[PDB]
């Protein structure tokens, strides 16, 4: 079961623990950990006894895709509390970054926009090179404007998309050069 640490409050929100699961806890003001600061569930019970020595509310915020909150998650949030989100690198956040707890429910969370591939097989099948010198890299964040040109001997076709294209959530319009 979830141990009742004296002069302290748990960090993890889980109540039932299987074997070898760790139980994180922190000590209250004026106290600190004694030896081990966590507890492990073994057959005879918790091996490290959680001890501390002398020196309408909402639930957890909803998880998003390719992102996470900036603070540390809590089991219960007091009313009028607010957390913020942030996407991974080269991802673009779309929507309200901050959500607020009101009357046991959160506000609408944002999403994360997917960047694009600059595929090497597509570049060779369309006969285009980056034209800003590079080995690779410089990859299309959602909203970034890439550019290419044709190879030496090809030209843009009649209805080929512009050489300067912008990626939008995992979709990229590659130019094409024929003849």
């Amino acid at each position: 079961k979830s141990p009742d640490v004296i002069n302290g409050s748990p960090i993890s929100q889980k109540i039932i623990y299987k074997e070898n699961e760790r139980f994180q806890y922190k000590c209250n003001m004026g106290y600190e950990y004694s030896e081990r600061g966590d507890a492990v569930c073994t057959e005879s019970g918790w091996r490290p006894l959680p001890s501390c020595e002398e020196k309408g509310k909402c639930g957890p915020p909803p998880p998003i895709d390719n992102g996470d909150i900036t603070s540390f998650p809590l089991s219960v949030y007091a009313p009028a509390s607010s957390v913020e989100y942030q996407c991974q690198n080269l991802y673009q956040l779309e929507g309200n970054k901050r959500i607020t707890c009101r009357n046991g429910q959160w506000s609408e969370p944002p999403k994360c926009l997917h960047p694009c591939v600059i595929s090497r097989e597509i570049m060779e099948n369309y006969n285009i090179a980056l034209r800003w010198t590079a080995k690779q890299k410089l990859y299309s964040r959602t909203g970034e404007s890439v550019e290419f040109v044709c190879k030496r001997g090809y030209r843009l076709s009649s209805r080929s998309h512009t050489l300067r294209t912008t990626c939008w959530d995992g979709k990229l319009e590659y130019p094409t050069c024929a003849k």
Binding site: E35, R36, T42, S44, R47, P48, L49, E54
Partner: protein, 640 residues
């Protein structure tokens, strides 16, 4: 300025009650103390956790009694340790203590010593703890053939059996002769294996006993009279024996026996007694060495065969291990401390024995150069020699000789020992000496413990009390304080000796102060005191009837058994013919106390090279908050 100190036995045993004494010297008010014992090094479980308070009414001295369960957590294999953590207020004092796997003691008693193929072996296993008190545990028993292969295992319980476990094992008709063994061990301690042997052989009772008894317990190599031996033959019911005896002698060298055919004699056994002399000439002619000095160190054995005139019974008996010596005695310093206090009286426990190892009674002993210091051995062959040491750092070398009058100087026994100066803290020359009159001490008396102090007078008034501890059977029996007034050099402690001191106890006392360069100093001293080996209670079996009434085959008899109230007594009646054939592995009281003393954690007669050596050598671990502590002990066995 305040110093917190803990003392715990050198080695901690499982399922045994262990005491811990807590002191807060130079402190005021109440000191909350919480003692926790954890495993080493992981601290997965809290093996014990007790609390106490050190109040000024108790002179800031308390104890914590705890029993460590034999948890399934401990793993031949590596040695196991525990962390002892004492918390006084803010301060915490920890010590890493060695753990012994011995759970307690197991004693095996077989009804007989030798058995015929087909018979049943009846044996009882007594299951006690380190206090010899009956306990209820699970015991593993292994029956082992002379070859060594275990042939029958079992796992039984001692619960509701009052510490006595009655078992039996049937011997097959077709069986291998020789020395069989029973091997038992507690379930919790598979490393502590107790054993007893019993011979299996085809035999018949001899109906009488033959006794080969030499005049002396040895043979002086320059005695022209030779070894005179008296043969005493008597029936198992008392009456003497008339017959004829064939006696023959031999020389034993280690394990090589050389019979002397020329020494063979046929003598009449008249009135149950006969005499036969091995002449010195035959002895020298028998061995192929003219130099008699080479026979010294070897032994003689005598074999006698007595045949009744009726020719219906014959008994062969032997008496071996008769050392050929040049001195009737042998001096040992195995009971005398090997550390002295310069300037204070140094006590020596001389141990004079006969060539066969038995104690020697009334033997004059003295120190070379000090004819005044001449003492007499007691009934246990232990004499006390007190000398006066000069204040010095020179190794005190003692040579003790026997001064038995009427014995020439060439035959007097001699032995040489050496003692080292008790090194003090910062060469402060602060010494403590505990002395006790060496004499057979018995339960129910009182021993005066003399605390004698020697130190400079500049800090003698600060010493207001001594801390004394008693070690018995490998556990702390009693701890207390001894009030000492400024100016008094010697104070007397009336120590009441009860049955809890059997067979022996160590008294280690120490005092602490702040001296010299404002350094915290501890000075200690210990002494070993022997007690008259006996039972804790009593058990006597005597005749419960009139001694005009003679025992007759089949006749009812009354047996008077007088012992402790509520005790469960187990009995056995054995024919003395059995003991005429084999008298080994017999359960006595002396053997029980022998086993107990061999599982002792002390390794010295007394004292040590420093204040930590006194505690370590007396089986104790001292650890103060200021940092003064004893070195670690990682050896279950004492140092050689």
């Amino acid at each position: 300025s305040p110093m917190y100190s803990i003392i715990t036995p050198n080695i901690l045993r499982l399922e045994s009650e262990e005491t811990m004494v807590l002191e807060a010297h130079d402190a005021q008010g109440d000191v909350p103390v919480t003692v926790t014992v954890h495993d080493f090094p992981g601290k997965k479980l809290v093996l014990s956790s007790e609390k106490t308070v050190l109040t000024p009414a108790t002179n800031h001295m308390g104890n914590v009694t705890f029993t460590i369960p034999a948890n399934r957590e401990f793993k031949k294999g590596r040695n196991k340790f525990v962390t002892v953590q004492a918390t006084f207020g803010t301060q915490v004092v920890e010590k890493v203590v060695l753990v012994s796997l011995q759970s307690g003691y197991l004693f095996i008693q077989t009804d007989k010593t030798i058995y015929t193929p087909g018979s049943t072996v009846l044996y009882r296993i007594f299951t006690v703890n380190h206090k010899l008190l009956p306990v209820g545990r699970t015991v593993m028993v292994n029956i082992e053939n002379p070859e060594g292969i275990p042939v029958k295992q079992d796992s039984l319980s001692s619960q509701n059996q009052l510490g006595v476990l009655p078992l039996s094992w049937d011997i097959p008709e077709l069986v291998n002769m020789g020395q069989w063994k029973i091997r038992a061990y507690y379930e919790n301690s598979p490393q502590q294996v107790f054993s007893t042997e019993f011979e299996v052989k085809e035999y018949v009772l001899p109906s009488f006993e033959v006794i080969v008894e030499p005049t002396e317990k040895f043979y002086y190599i320059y005695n022209e009279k030779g070894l005179e031996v008296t043969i005493t033959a008597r029936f198992l019911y008392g009456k003497k024996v008339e017959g004829t005896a064939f006696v023959i002698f031999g020389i034993q060298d280690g394990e090589q026996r050389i019979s002397l055919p020329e020494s063979l004699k046929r003598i009449p056994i008249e009135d149950g007694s006969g005499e036969v002399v091995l002449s010195r000439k035959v002895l020298l002619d028998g061995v192929q060495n003219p130099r008699a000095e080479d026979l010294v160190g070897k032994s003689l054995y005598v074999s006698a065969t007595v045949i009744l005139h009726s020719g219906s019974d014959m008994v062969q008996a032997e008496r071996s291990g008769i050392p050929i010596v040049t001195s009737p005695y042998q001096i040992h310093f195995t009971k005398t401390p090997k550390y002295f206090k310069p300037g204070m009286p140094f006590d020596l426990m001389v141990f004079v024995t006969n060539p066969d190892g038995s104690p020697a009674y009334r033997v004059p002993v003295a120190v070379q150069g000090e004819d005044t210091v001449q003492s007499l051995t007691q009934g246990d062959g232990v004499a006390k020699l007190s000398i006066n040491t000069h204040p010095s750092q020179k190794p005190l070398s003692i040579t003790v000789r026997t001064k038995k009058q009427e014995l020439s100087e060439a035959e007097q026994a001699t032995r040489t020992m050496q003692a080292l100066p008790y090194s003090t803290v910062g060469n402060s020359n602060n010494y403590l000496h505990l002395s006790v009159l060496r004499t057979e001490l018995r339960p129910g008396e009182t021993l005066n413990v003399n605390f004698l102090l020697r130190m400079d007078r500049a800090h003698e008034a600060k010493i207001r009390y001594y801390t004394y501890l008693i070690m018995n059977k490998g556990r702390l029996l009693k701890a207390g304080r001894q009030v000492r007034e400024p100016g008094q050099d010697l104070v007397v402690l009336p120590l009441s000796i009860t049955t809890d001191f059997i067979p022996s106890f160590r008294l280690v006392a120490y005092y602490t102060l702040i001296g010299a360069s404002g350094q915290r100093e501890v000075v200690a001293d210990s002494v070993w005191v022997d007690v008259k080996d006996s039972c804790v209670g009593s058990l006597v079996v005597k005749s419960g009837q009139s001694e005009d009434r003679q025992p007759v085959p089949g006749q009812q008899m009354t047996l008077k058994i007088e012992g402790d109230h509520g005790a469960r007594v187990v009995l056995v009646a054995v024919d003395k013919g059995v003991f005429v054939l084999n008298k080994k592995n017999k359960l006595t009281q002396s053997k029980i106390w022998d086993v107990v003393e061999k599982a002792d954690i002390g390794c010295t007669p007394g004292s040590g090279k420093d204040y930590a050596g006194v505690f370590s050598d007396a089986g104790l671990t001292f650890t103060s908050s200021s940092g003064q502590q004893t070195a670690q002990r990682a050896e279950l066995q004492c140092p050689q």
